[PDB]
Each structure stands twice: as structure tokens, then as C-alpha cells.
């Protein structure tokens, strides 16, 4: 199974991850509904994403720790089929939310004056209610608790990630082009948005991409170590802990609001 000494090392590596995922994603929620500066229609995208992150960290991580360190699935076919489907529903509801947050972050730059009148909270709510529906329609497409259909396994990874990745890298390379085109505030206005954009579009790729590449690489059947895949699995669940910080710390409004709650 494991070393026991390690088992306490793995559980403490997690647990802290859970506390960090339900500390940022909750600080975002207690911040949008609390500060009169974030009461924008566009700020509801960060509350549903935070809810999804808090849900993953406390509904799929506690049991992933169990399946991996214990070795067997203590439960059977009554929180295992629910766990393997609530994972694909809580991570595909974070990737697709990151895609939406970037599309509403790009239509308001390229279509700047026409989009505000089409940005009412009703539209934001109707987009949040659709991202969630699609996130759950990918999870449920109508003793080891390990994932077990090649044709579907691709459809879902490509729609769940490749698509949100390709439509979010483009929405950030056509925003970096627009913004640097405004410059043509002294050698740091650009040097800051080269980093504010690089972190935003790179933490995603360095957290989630390796897992999905390996999963479809094994979907085609190219061998990936049994280990060196467990790092990737846990790497994604650890990206939801950074998501609440990436989309909030680079914002002066959010930063001044956090100062009030934690003065
Ligand atoms: C097989 N598959 C298709 C889409 C999709 C989305 C997320 C995940 C997981 C996220 C972290 C580790 N557990 C699985 C798996 C997924």
C-alpha cells in the first residue's frame, strides 16, 4: 500500500490543499457580495467558478485521497459512480468557466461600446446557467474505483479542455495584441501586462494540460508511467486552488476589498 509515514505525508499535503481551495474560493464569494465595487454583471462568473472549486476540493478530493493512499475503494458503486461523475462535472465546470470568463473579458475589449448594453446581469446569469448545464451533460452522457469508452473518452477531454484551452489562449493572444497596440506607465505598463497575461494563460496550461494530454495519450494507448500520472491528477485538483487567486489578485478592486475583510 504505502509507508504510513508517507500516508500521513500525502494526507497533510492534501487537507492543506482543501483548506487553501476553500479559503480563496470562499474569500471571492464573501468579497463580490460584500463590496459595492464588485457588484458588476461580469463578476458573477467568478462566484460560480469559486463555488465549483469549493465543491471539488470538498467533494472529490477527500475521496481521491482515500482511493489512492488506502488503495482500495472502501465504498462500492454508490459513491464511486457518483465520485467519478462528480469529478468530471466539477472540473469541466471550472475549465468551461475559465473559458467564459475570458470570452466576456474579450468581447468587452473588441466590441467595447456595443457590448455593455448586452452585458446585463440577466445575460451573465443565463451564461452561468448554461456553462453548468454543459458541465453536467459531459459527466453524465445518457475493489478499485478507477475510471473505466475510447470514443467518448476523447470527445469529453477535447470538449472539456482542448476546446476551452484553444478558445482561451486565442482570447488572450488577441488581447495582448490589442493592448500592446495601444502603447504604440514607463516600461512597466507593458512589462506588467506581459506577466499579468502570462501567468493567467500559463497556470492553466501547466496545471491542467499535462493531465489531459496524458489521458488522451493513454486513450490512444501510448504508455504513461502509472506514477508521473498521479502527479498530473493531483496537479489539476491543485489548479482549482489557484484559480480564485489568479482572477482576483491582479485586480485593484478585489485587492482593496480583501484588505477590508482581512485588515
Ligand atoms: C476523462 N475526463 C474527460 C473530461 C474530464 C475532466 C476532468 C477530469 C478530472 C480531473 C482531475 C482528476 N480527476 C479527473 C477527467 C476528465
Swiss-Prot record:
Result when mutating residue 27 to F: In FPLD8; uncertain significance; decreased function in adenylate cyclase-inhibiting adrenergic receptor signaling pathway
One Gene Ontology term of the molecular function aspect: epinephrine binding
Compartments, as annotated in UniProt: Cell membrane
Effect of residue 104 to N: Lower affinity for agonists. Eliminates guanine nucleotide-sensitive agonist binding
Cited InterPro entries: ADR_fam (IPR002233), ADRA2A_rcpt (IPR001946), GPCR_Rhodpsn (IPR000276), GPCR_Rhodpsn_7TM (IPR017452)
Membrane-spanning intervals of the chain: 8-33, 45-70, 81-103, 126-142, 151-173, 196-216, 231-250
UniProt KW Ribosomal protein keyword: no
Stretches in topological domain Extracellular: 71-80, 217-230
Keyword Lipoprotein: yes
Outcome of mutating residue 233 to N: 350-fold reduced affinity for alpha-2 antagonist yohimbine, 3000-fold increase for beta-antagonist alprenolol
Stored SMART domains: 7TM_GPCR_Srsx
Family, per entry: Belongs to the G-protein coupled receptor 1 family. Adrenergic receptor subfamily. ADRA2A sub-subfamily.
Matching PANTHER family: ADRENERGIC RECEPTOR-RELATED G-PROTEIN COUPLED RECEPTOR, ALPHA-2A ADRENERGIC RECEPTOR
Official protein name in the record: Alpha-2A adrenergic receptor
Provenance organism: Homo sapiens (Human)
Origin organism lineage: Eukaryota, Metazoa, Chordata, Craniata, Vertebrata
Amino acid at each position: 500500500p504505502y509507508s504510513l509515514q508517507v500516508t500521513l505525508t500525502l494526507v497533510c499535503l492534501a487537507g492543506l490543499l482543501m483548506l487553501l481551495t476553500v479559503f480563496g474560493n470562499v474569500l471571492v464569494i464573501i468579497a463580490v457580495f460584500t463590496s459595492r465595487a464588485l457588484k458588476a454583471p461580469q463578476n458573477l462568473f467568478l462566484v460560480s467558478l469559486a463555488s465549483a472549486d469549493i465543491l471539488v476540493a470538498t467533494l472529490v478530493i477527500p475521496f481521491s485521497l482515500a482511493n489512492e493512499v488506502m488503495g482500495y475503494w472502501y465504498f462500492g458503486k454508490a459513491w464511486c459512480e457518483i465520485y467519478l461523475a462528480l469529478d468530471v462535472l466539477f472540473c469541466t465546470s471550472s475549465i468551461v468557466h475559465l473559458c467564459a470568463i475570458s470570452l466576456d473579458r474579450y468581447w468587452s475589449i473588441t466590441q467595447a461600446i456595443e457590448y455593455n448594453l448586452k452585458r446585463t446581469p440577466r445575460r451573465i446569469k443565463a451564461i452561468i446557467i448554461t456553462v453548468w448545464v454543459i458541465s453536467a451533460v459531459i459527466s453524465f452522457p445518457p475493489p478499485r474505483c478507477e475510471i473505466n469508452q475510447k470514443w467518448y473518452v476523447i470527445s469529453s477531454c477535447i470538449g472539456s479542455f482542448f476546446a476551452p484551452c484553444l478558445i482561451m489562449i486565442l482570447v488572450y493572444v488577441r488581447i495582448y495584441q490589442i493592448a500592446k497596440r495601444r502603447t504604440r506607465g514607463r516600461q512597466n505598463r507593458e512589462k506588467r501586462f506581459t506577466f499579468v497575461l502570462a501567468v493567467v494563460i500559463g497556470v492553466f496550461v501547466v496545471c491542467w494540460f499535462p493531465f489531459f494530454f496524458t489521458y488522451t495519450l493513454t486513450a490512444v494507448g501510448c504508455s504513461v508511467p502509472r506514477t508521473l500520472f498521479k502527479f498530473f491528477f493531483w496537479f489539476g485538483y491543485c489548479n482549482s486552488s489557484l484559480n480564485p487567486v489568479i482572477y482576483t489578485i491582479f485586480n485593484h478592486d478585489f485587492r482593496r476589498a480583501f484588505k477590508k475583510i482581512l485588515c
